[PDB]
Amino acid sequence: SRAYDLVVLGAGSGGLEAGWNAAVTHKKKVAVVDVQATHGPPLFAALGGTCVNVGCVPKKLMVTGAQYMDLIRESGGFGWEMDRESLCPNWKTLIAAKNKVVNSINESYKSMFADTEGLSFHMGFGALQDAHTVVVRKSEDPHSDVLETLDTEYILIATGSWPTRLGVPGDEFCITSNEAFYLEDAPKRMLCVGGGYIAVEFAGIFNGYKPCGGYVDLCYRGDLILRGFDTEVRKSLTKQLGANGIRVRTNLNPTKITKNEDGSNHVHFNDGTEEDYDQVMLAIGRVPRSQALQLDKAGVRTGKNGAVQVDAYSKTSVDNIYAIGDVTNRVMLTPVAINEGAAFVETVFGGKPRATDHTKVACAVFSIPPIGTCGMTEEEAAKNYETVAVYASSFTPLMHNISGSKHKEFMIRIITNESNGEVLGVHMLGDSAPEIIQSVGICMKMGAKISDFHSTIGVHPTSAEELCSMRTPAYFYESGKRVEKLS
Amino acid sequence: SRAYDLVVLGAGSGGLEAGWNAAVTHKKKVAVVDVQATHGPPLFAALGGTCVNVGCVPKKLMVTGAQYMDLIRESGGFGWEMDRESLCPNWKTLIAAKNKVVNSINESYKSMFADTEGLSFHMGFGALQDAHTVVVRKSEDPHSDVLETLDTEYILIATGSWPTRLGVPGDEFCITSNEAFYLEDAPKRMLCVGGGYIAVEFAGIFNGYKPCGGYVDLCYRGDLILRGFDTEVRKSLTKQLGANGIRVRTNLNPTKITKNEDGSNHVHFNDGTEEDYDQVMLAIGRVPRSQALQLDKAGVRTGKNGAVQVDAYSKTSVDNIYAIGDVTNRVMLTPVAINEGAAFVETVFGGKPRATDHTKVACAVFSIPPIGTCGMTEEEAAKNYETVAVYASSFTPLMHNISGSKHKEFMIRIITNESNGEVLGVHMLGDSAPEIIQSVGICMKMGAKISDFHSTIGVHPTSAEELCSMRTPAYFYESGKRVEK
């Protein structure tokens, strides 16, 4: 009937998941469209999506590298002795090693397309022509040469999101998360704008890889970084980023940026101050990447900042056109898009339909002291629950009395419904938190109670065993108000 | 009525749990008996039990120290340059800092007793006289001076366990886990006898803290270390301990040990070979410490290796006498004894009786690549289950392509009942495994199914998220047989 069963615009986390699934476990003719084959600074994303090329994968590698600064310093207390006087890392050999790993994943995706029959990779910029036609061009410009014209039954949009910039003079002098991955040298005088995921995470990277006398300044528009997270975790993280070197700067926002006679950028703030930074990164946000896809031509509903209007099954305004991942602007994570993609395949090609559960999704923040959250905060649970108990526990891991890093305090805060005992949210700060929160997310998806926690015999010399030691709540929330006692 | 409500013999993990609980949350007159107040060689354990003084606490500190050997080496690939040749750690400043931490906990317990009313610490060797009288002597000898005579309603035994040696000539030339904590110098030529918990853990410590050209030989009586653990996890550890430096030797056992004219020990093996070790540690096992408690005088039953025979509520032969922890020889762990102790309090002084759940208890092995297990192995689940599915997954963390340690392979193995899909066992090998297994243990006590795992949306750049990626089983066991499908 048609040339392909599916054309996937975007070979991302979600995109490739659906592509492979339709082609292998259903034997369908699948075409996957993407910008380029291997990662690279002209057009950053590639085969594997942001996640693989300019996202989670390289980020984690760099965060792991920066984490050594602490560990090399901490080793002293345990009897490990070396030349610690102004010891600095090699940024060039990090990026070198990072690229070799990213490209290796790029390369194994190439041979995947050469070895899987039904799957075909189509390089270029995809755009919609009608309900059944996707046109591949060599540019985002609608007037540039047409490389391919794909005729398909279904169309899936998985083009993800794209960095947001702030509309100020000197905006193009700044870098984003994209450019950060390919910097020639590690900046000495660094400014991270914003208080989001990337802002906090990258602040840690640069602070680990700063040269001599270098400093990283994080500035945030509001008065507490990481809005939406547990207020007590946020405050404790702010304190710990400081103790680690990163100078946090609340209620501050840049307005003017100009370049100097040495390359460095001159930044003008809100309070009127002027400081000189070698690099300035903007972690403002990520808007869904759909501006060039010509959704109007096919009649696909575009809403909140270019987000693609979808229902619970990812179906758009047109019955055969679907969208998954960051482009839908639901929950912008890698494992979410993968689930949304697998659920899409099961729905249309599998027969048995299934919707993606967006609630109670465990995620992490790979800041130097990492965060692990799943579920509701105090503010949210007290907002729409009758009565809620709040459990709290802060402890310094015993090893840190030797290592010297006494600021490193592990924190667990469980938020439960008082009526039932149901765990509505668990919030963690400290090493191993992203690992621990994963299996917590399993429990919350099972709908677990606080009684299920402190009844499990612990595993002693661990941080996670502290989940099972919280019996008495710190305080309560009664019909909205913060109360220290409950009659 | 009489002097004390409770006399606890042993200020251990469980002993101190039962003491504090009865005294604070029930306002009972509680006496706690122990050998000494601060850690120290002559009699190793102190206030806090084995676990605090010569157990989990110091062990973990030393395992964390050793892990820096890998971490310093691994940093190179990420751009961290320094002097790496001949770089060996300072053992003396490790023990120094270890002692400082252990002593502060000792001190913390000392001020606890002085501030908690009802609780009183009584230094000396406790021994039974009758169903209500506990005698405190200055020595383990039953004829040394009597320091105190405590008269109590209830008696709780929490004296824990003690290292086992092997009956061979040269047995007293060896060290145990106890002496290992207070070695004056890090051994160059090390031998670890046995293939149990302590063996694998300490092998990693000494291998981390070995001087120049040093080596650690681990010898085990059988042909695969750590019996009772997942056979595939065991084999993968054996390779990784090897790759990390430790030379594993199976089907081998020492028989004769003699000292030389420089201090070093000469060891005669099972195959007939002889080799020289600066130090030789015996991780043979731990027998319940009840040899000098005179349970006969009070009429308390001692069965297999002197273990105090108890029911599900810790009650012994006599209705007032109880026992918890390693001395019962049920499950020799710190959090087990704490639970046994807390349940003991609830049983008698709390009103509401409660028994300790010994099945499906998550534990860990702090090897250089750590282990995290909970529930049944393949062998055990195939013995007493109709049909069982075996899920397996091995993967190299992405960072290890840069760090150079490509041998460090993370492994997860889930063992489920094929009938309903119930998770009967989870076995892990790699970093964070002891952290991950804890919340796995929450699920298994919760009675979780494999469908609960792979239906949870993961947390991408983690090792624990792979737990939710196992959908199709590697193979099956059908009525006992290893079945392809």
Ligand SMILES: Cc1cc2nc3c(=O)[nH]c(=O)nc-3n(C[C@H](O)[C@H](O)[C@H](O)COP(=O)(O)OP(=O)(O)OC[C@H]3O[C@@H](n4cnc5c(N)ncnc54)[C@H](O)[C@@H]3O)c2cc1C
């Ligand atoms: C720096 C950074 C770090 C992150 N770290 C994490 C993390 O640690 N954990 C986590 O869960 N999430 C993380 N995220 C988010 C995660 O990377 C995304 O949510 C994920 O990539 C979404 O998958 P997707 O398939 O929807 O989009 P993507 O994976 O980004 O796929 C989009 C692909 O579509 C292609 N494309 C774009 N336009 C077109 C077009 N015109 N025609 C054809 N193809 C096109 C692009 O080239 C791109 O390859 C991070 C994000 C960033 C930016």
Ligand SMILES: Cc1cc2nc3c(=O)[nH]c(=O)nc-3n(C[C@H](O)[C@H](O)[C@H](O)COP(=O)(O)OP(=O)(O)OC[C@H]3O[C@@H](n4cnc5c(N)ncnc54)[C@H](O)[C@@H]3O)c2cc1C
């Ligand atoms: C090296 C090592 C590492 C370990 N690591 C871990 C681990 O990481 N995780 C884990 O879960 N378990 C671990 N264990 C096991 C754990 O330490 C014990 O199971 C736990 O301490 C048991 O608690 P208990 O109260 O029954 O005995 P203990 O905590 O050992 O208490 C016994 C106390 O009784 C005292 N005592 C002895 N005889 C008398 C007497 N005659 N009169 C009065 N008092 C007496 C002793 O001085 C001692 O202080 C480890 C054990 C060892 C040896």
Ligand SMILES: NC(=O)C1=CN([C@@H]2O[C@H](COP(=O)(O)OP(=O)(O)OC[C@H]3O[C@@H](n4cnc5c(N)ncnc54)[C@H](OP(=O)(O)O)[C@@H]3O)[C@@H](O)[C@H]2O)C=CC1
């Ligand atoms: N799971 C993980 O480990 C990671 C996930 N991600 C995903 O990718 C996305 C990356 O977006 P990111 O921007 O880094 O994080 P966010 O979009 O969550 O947060 C952006 C921050 O920038 C601030 N901000 C927004 N607009 C402005 C402005 N105009 N001027 C100054 N400050 C502003 C916001 O302030 P305010 O709070 O006041 O609105 C907020 O603190 C995340 O949303 C997340 O979904 C990214 C990295 C890691």
Ligand SMILES: NC(=O)C1=CN([C@@H]2O[C@H](COP(=O)(O)OP(=O)(O)OC[C@H]3O[C@@H](n4cnc5c(N)ncnc54)[C@H](OP(=O)(O)O)[C@@H]3O)[C@@H](O)[C@H]2O)C=CC1
């Ligand atoms: N949870 C944790 O992290 C830790 C817990 N522990 C606790 O300490 C307890 C005791 O540890 P451990 O001392 O290592 O005892 P184990 O029972 O754990 O292991 C003893 C090892 O020595 C071997 N062995 C036994 N008898 C002899 C013998 N006569 N000659 C030669 N080899 C022999 C055994 O092999 P085989 O019997 O298979 O032939 C076994 O491999 C453990 O049960 C555990 O509860 C200790 C350290 C860490």
Ligand SMILES: [Ag+]
């Ligand atoms: Ag990713």
Ligand SMILES: [Ag+]
């Ligand atoms: Ag559960």
Ligand SMILES: [Ag+]
């Ligand atoms: Ag302990």
Ligand SMILES: [Ag+]
């Ligand atoms: Ag669970």
